RNA sequence: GUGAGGGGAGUGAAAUAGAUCCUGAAACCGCAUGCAUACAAGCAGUGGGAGCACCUUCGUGGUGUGACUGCGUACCUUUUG
RNA sequence: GCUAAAACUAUGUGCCGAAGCUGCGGAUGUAUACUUUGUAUACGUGGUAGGGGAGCGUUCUGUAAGCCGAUGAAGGUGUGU
């Protein structure tokens, strides 16, 4: 029923990517692509890459037409975060966490 | 100043409930027949019957 | 389990008319609150509203005993630093009897959503005529 | 003979957390709050098992009073008459009849009034 | 099946379980361990000659 | 058509063909029990208020079986006093089926 | 993007055994379904309780939510408290 | 909110009112009587610091060259009792 596509290691936090992922949930593939092409967010290119991968998989493996496809489900999961040390004033040090997220997109119909 | 207690996830989501994004104004061009931002020049160089970067 | 509660969908409310000319405020208010909460019916339940609708006629003709016509004072306070308004019973019943009856009945009713729903079933009119003629209210003694 | 505290502690925590399903916030996730919540719920149940009888008796008395005043009497006078008429029906059945069977309650009130005279 | 290694038991009253302090509320010993509230006798090595 | 019977130190309003639960009784399953102490009998409009007891009225029923209710937890605790305890309880009951209210 | 990553095919008893590789829990974070929630004030529960949605050994039954209502100011130490 | 009171003085009938007493069911400690002698009987069963009694789980050793187990053990996760 659902053709899936996963993108792991997006080098961006999940909180910043969910804002973009909420825009295309439930729309058609053409409308979603048009929305993602003319946006200025950073996670937009990653979501667009994942959506194009899902559509290509649906076309090749399952042999589904592209005009009937729509964004059925989409979500973002947390990933491994890198830990670094930042020197503060008066000899103190803080811990910085570079966050990463995975994107999952399933197109249906 | 710093908080005296934790902030529950309910209040956090209630505050974040105003962080929704919005779509842009995209229209179909009359000449090229391609989707483009309204009042903006198409990526190929065409706008309002005129063509920039003549090739 | 045998003790049953009133179904809110099966409760019926009937309209009554009470004339308030030359009656004491306290006794009339207690009777109105009692008949408005629903203590007179055998299917009374504390968590369901089973009262009746009460329409008060001739609201400005209510009377109080003793010297309470000039000594009974009503206070309200706006949360501004100096907003303590005080009025007398005479002027208040002269220009707003509905506030008098609403205060008297709300003071004797429960405090909560059920009390807010019960207080809406009471209508107060200064004149001798009421617009709720379509519901066919029955005259009540007191 | 080294003993590890994993299995039994996990099982105790799991039982305590399962006994507190449906609570709000950390009362359903954190063990430290769930334990206190379960203890407080137990105490409240112990107290309400006593309060319930008083609540239901008050309800029965109110319904019987409503019925008696409908039949032209009071609760005190009707109870006194029923005690003088050698009737030993409790307040539960009286309230049930007053709510359901009007003519039976009218007959009971008539008998009580006749016994009072 | 009598007179086996799993059929022998001591006489009644010969064996007892030793007291363990500080193992909960229901154990009876409790939190302090039978020493009471703070004092010289409540500390470790608490006792006069 | 209903009756008022006494059982287990309490009073019940019974109608013919009804299943109820009363206190634990020593009567074995499958046996019949006849209450000869009826407080009130209502035949719709014929009202018999037997103040001490309705003379000549009996209610016959059958014993379905015996059982126990669900578990109830009793918890006692005294704050900052180092005292708490727990207990369980399951109350016994006997199931009766009203067969006849002849009388 | 000749990248990372993923979907097919194939090996394998097993690929949510794919090299961040036995089993793989909790705190923490998403998605979907069911119910409740935008005129009513507080240790967030407890005793009652209408309705709604799926199950059925079709009930004076089960599983979730639960408007309305009486009562109710966390835990441990130290203290006369 | 209350004025021949819903205030005060005296008196009489009723009623409400607690975990008090009684009604039914169940559990436990002590003491006596019984004709296997474990069912009755009476008194009891709030409790910190404390003293006494009885038990539930985990690891290892003998019983154990025994018993269960790929027709699925240990562990994890729900349900019923
Ligand atoms: Mg002690
Ligand atoms: Mg001291
Ligand atoms: Mg000492
Ligand atoms: Mg309002
Ligand atoms: Mg509302
Ligand atoms: Mg509840
Ligand atoms: Mg200390
Ligand atoms: Mg009582
Ligand atoms: Mg006692
Ligand atoms: Mg004791
Ligand atoms: Mg061994
Ligand atoms: Mg062994
Ligand atoms: Mg298996
Ligand atoms: Mg082992």
Curated annotation (Swiss-Prot), chain B:
UniProt superkingdom: Bacteria
Keywords: Ribonucleoprotein, Ribosomal protein
GO cellular component, one term: large ribosomal subunit
Biased composition (Basic residues): 6-15
MF annotations from Gene Ontology: structural constituent of ribosome
Skewed-composition ranges (Polar residues): 24-33
GO terms, biological process: translation
Family: Belongs to the bacterial ribosomal protein bL32 family.
Protein name: Large ribosomal subunit protein bL32
Curated annotation (Swiss-Prot), chain C:
Alphabetical UniProt keywords: Ribonucleoprotein, Ribosomal protein
GO molecular function: mRNA binding; structural constituent of ribosome
GO biological process: negative regulation of translation; translation
Superkingdom, taxonomy of origin: Bacteria
Xref: SUPFAM superfamilies: Ribosomal protein L13
This protein's GO CC annotations: cytosolic large ribosomal subunit
NCBIfam families, per the entry: rplM_bact
Protein family according to the UniProt entry: Belongs to the universal ribosomal protein uL13 family.
Subunit structure, as described in the record: Part of the 50S ribosomal subunit.
Function per UniProt: This protein is one of the early assembly proteins of the 50S ribosomal subunit, although it is not seen to bind rRNA by itself. It is important during the early stages of 50S assembly.
Name listed for the protein in its UniProt record: Large ribosomal subunit protein uL13
Lineage: Bacteria, Pseudomonadati, Pseudomonadota, Gammaproteobacteria, Moraxellales
UniProtKB/Swiss-Prot annotation, chain E:
Regions of compositional bias (Gly residues) in chain numbering: 23-37
Annotated spans, Disordered: 1-49
UniProt family annotation: Belongs to the universal ribosomal protein uL15 family.
The protein's assembly and partners: Part of the 50S ribosomal subunit.
Role, per record: Binds to the 23S rRNA.
Protein name: Large ribosomal subunit protein uL15
Biological source species: Acinetobacter baumannii (strain AB0057)
Parent sequence residues shown: 1 to 49 of 146
Curated annotation (Swiss-Prot), chain F:
TM region(s), chain numbering: none
SUPFAM superfamilies in UniProt: L21p-like
Presence of keyword Membrane: no
GO (cellular component) term, any one: ribosome
InterPro entries documented for this protein: bL21-like, bL21-like_sf, Ribosomal_bL21, Ribosomal_bL21_CS
Listed GO MF terms: rRNA binding; structural constituent of ribosome
Claim: Lipoprotein is one of the keywords in the record: no
Top-rank taxon, per record: Bacteria
A Pfam family assignment: Ribosomal_L21p
Any GO BP: translation
Keywords for the protein's UniProt record, in alphabetical order: Ribonucleoprotein, Ribosomal protein, RNA-binding, rRNA-binding
Quaternary context: Part of the 50S ribosomal subunit. Contacts protein L20.
Family, similarity comment: Belongs to the bacterial ribosomal protein bL21 family.
Function of the molecule: This protein binds to 23S rRNA in the presence of protein L20.
UniProt-listed PANTHER family: 50S RIBOSOMAL PROTEIN L21, LARGE RIBOSOMAL SUBUNIT PROTEIN BL21M
Record-linked NCBIfam families: L21
Protein name: Large ribosomal subunit protein bL21
Species assigned in the record: Acinetobacter baumannii (strain AB0057)
Species lineage: Bacteria, Pseudomonadati, Pseudomonadota, Gammaproteobacteria, Moraxellales
Gene name for this UniProt entry: rplU
């Amino acid at each position: 029923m659902e053709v899936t596509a996963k993108l792991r290691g997006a080098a961006i936090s999940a909180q910043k990517a969910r804002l973009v992922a909420d825009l295309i949930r439930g729309k058609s593939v053409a409308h979603a692509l048009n929305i993602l092409n003319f946006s200025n967010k950073k996670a937009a290119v990653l979501v667009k890459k994942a959506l194009e991968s899902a559509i290509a998989n649906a076309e090749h493996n399952n042999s589904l037409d592209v005009d009937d496809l729509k964004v059925s489900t989409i979500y973002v999961d947390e990933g491994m975060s890198l830990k670094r040390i930042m020197p503060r004033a008066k000899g103190r040090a803080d811990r910085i966490t570079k966050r990463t997220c995975h994107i999952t997109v399933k197109v249906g119909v | 100043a710093v908080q005296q207690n934790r902030k529950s996830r309910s209040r956090r989501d209630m505050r974040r409930s105003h962080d929704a994004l919005t779509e842009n104004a995209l229209t179909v061009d009359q000449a090229t027949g391609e989707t483009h931002r309204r009042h903006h020049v198409t990526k190929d160089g065409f706008y309002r019957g005129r063509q920039l970067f003549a090739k | 389990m045998k003790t049953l509660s009133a179904k809110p969908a099966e409760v019926q409310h009937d309209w009554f008319v009470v004339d308030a000319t030359g009656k004491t405020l306290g006794r009339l208010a207690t009777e109105i609150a009692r008949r408005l909460r629903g203590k007179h019916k055998t299917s009374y339940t504390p968590h369901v509203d089973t009262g009746d609708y009460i329409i008060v006629i001739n609201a400005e003709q209510v009377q109080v005993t003793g010297n309470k016509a000039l000594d009974k004072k009503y206070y309200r306070h706006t949360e501004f630093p100096g907003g303590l308004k005080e009025t007398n019973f005479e002027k208040l019943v002269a220009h707003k009897p509905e506030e008098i009856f609403e205060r008297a009945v709300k003071g004797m009713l429960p405090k909560g959503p059920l009390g807010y729903a019960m207080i809406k079933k009471m209508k107060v009119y200064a004149g001798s005529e009421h617009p709720h003629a379509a519901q066919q209210p029955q005259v009540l003694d007191i | 003979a080294r003993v590890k505290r994993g299995v039994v502690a996990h099982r105790r925590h799991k039982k305590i957390l399962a006994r507190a399903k449906g609570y709000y916030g950390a009362r359903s996730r954190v063990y430290r709050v769930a334990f206190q919540a379960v203890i407080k719920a137990g105490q409240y149940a112990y107290r309400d098992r006593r309060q319930k009888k008083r609540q239901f008796r008050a309800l029965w008395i109110a319904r019987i009073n409503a019925g008696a005043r409908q039949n032209g009497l009071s609760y005190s006078r009707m109870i006194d008459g029923l005690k003088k008429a050698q009737v030993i029906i409790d307040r539960r059945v009286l309230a049930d009849i007053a709510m359901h069977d009007a003519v039976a309650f009218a007959a009971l009130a008539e008998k009580a009034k006749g016994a009072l005279a | 099946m009598t007179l086996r290694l799993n059929e022998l038991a001591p006489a009644e009253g010969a064996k007892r379980e030793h007291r363990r302090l500080g193992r909960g509320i229901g154990s009876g010993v409790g939190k302090t361990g039978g020493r009471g509230i703070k004092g010289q006798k409540s500390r470790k090595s608490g006792g006069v000659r | 058509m209903y009756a008022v019977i006494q059982s287990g130190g309490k009073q019940h309003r019974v109608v013919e063909g009804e299943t109820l639960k009363v206190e634990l009784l020593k009567a074995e399953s499958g046996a019949t029990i006849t209450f000869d102490d009826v407080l009130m009998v209502v035949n719709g409009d014929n009202i018999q208020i037997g103040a001490p007891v309705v003379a000549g009225a009996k209610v016959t029923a059958e014993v379905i079986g015996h059982g126990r209710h669900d578990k109830i937890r009793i918890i006692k605790m005294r704050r900052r006093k180092h005292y708490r305890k727990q207990q369980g309880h399951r109350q016994w009951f006997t199931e009766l089926k009203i067969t006849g209210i002849s009388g």
